[PDB]
Swiss-Prot record:
Protein name: Rho GDP-dissociation inhibitor 2
Major subcellular site: cytoplasm
Known function: Regulates the GDP/GTP exchange reaction of the Rho proteins by inhibiting the dissociation of GDP from them, and the subsequent binding of GTP to them. Regulates reorganization of the actin cytoskeleton mediated by Rho family members.
Coverage span on the entire protein: 64 to 200 of 201
GO MF annotation list: GTPase activator activity; GTPase activity; Rho GDP-dissociation inhibitor activity; small GTPase binding
């Protein structure tokens, strides 16, 4: 078992009718078929769940690349920092942001996320799809 294990991604959104989350311990190829849905203009935070099993780590970073077909990538990096080993998973949350809005904001976006560090370790790399819709349903 590696020292850092990424376990889950959650979109924290007070107005969502239900939990928006994905298990990151499973088959990564199957995560693409699981699309998660955000109402346009919704306020959200990205929450990354992870475990540190053996040794203090430093310089943890969450990197999130968002692709719409035919458009330059929308890139964001977030410093996560230093964490020591413990049985319970940790939770890191990005600052609050707003999903885009308007009919032209709707559609599917293809994300690729990286949980890494200062030593450029590939703790996890994974793809997931986001659908922006006019309504939650
Ligand atoms: O729209 C913008 C730029 N403008 C703003 O982000 C404004 C900032 C304040 N309101 C909106 N990027 C779009 C974008 C859409 C979805 C996400 C996304 C990713 C993960 C989780 C939830 C999300 F929503 C991120 C960015 C595009 C990406 C690629 C081509 S276009």
């Amino acid at each position: 078992a590696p020292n850092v294990v990424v376990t889950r991604l959650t979109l924290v959104c007070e107005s969502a009718p239900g939990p928006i989350t994905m298990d990151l311990t499973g088959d990564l190829e199957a995560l693409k078929k699981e699309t998660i849905v955000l109402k346009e203009g919704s306020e959200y935070r990205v929450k990354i769940h992870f475990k540190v099993n053996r040794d203090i780590v430093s310089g943890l970073k969450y990197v999130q690349h968002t692709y719409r077909t035919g458009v330059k990538v929308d890139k964001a990096t977030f410093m996560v920092g230093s964490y020591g080993p413990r049985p319970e998973e940790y939770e890191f949350l990005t600052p609050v942001e707003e999903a885009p809005k308007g009919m032209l904001a709707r559609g599917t976006y293809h994300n690729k996320s990286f949980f890494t560090d200062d030593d450029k370790q590939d703790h996890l790399s994974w793809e997931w799809n986001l659908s922006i819709k006019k309504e939650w349903t």
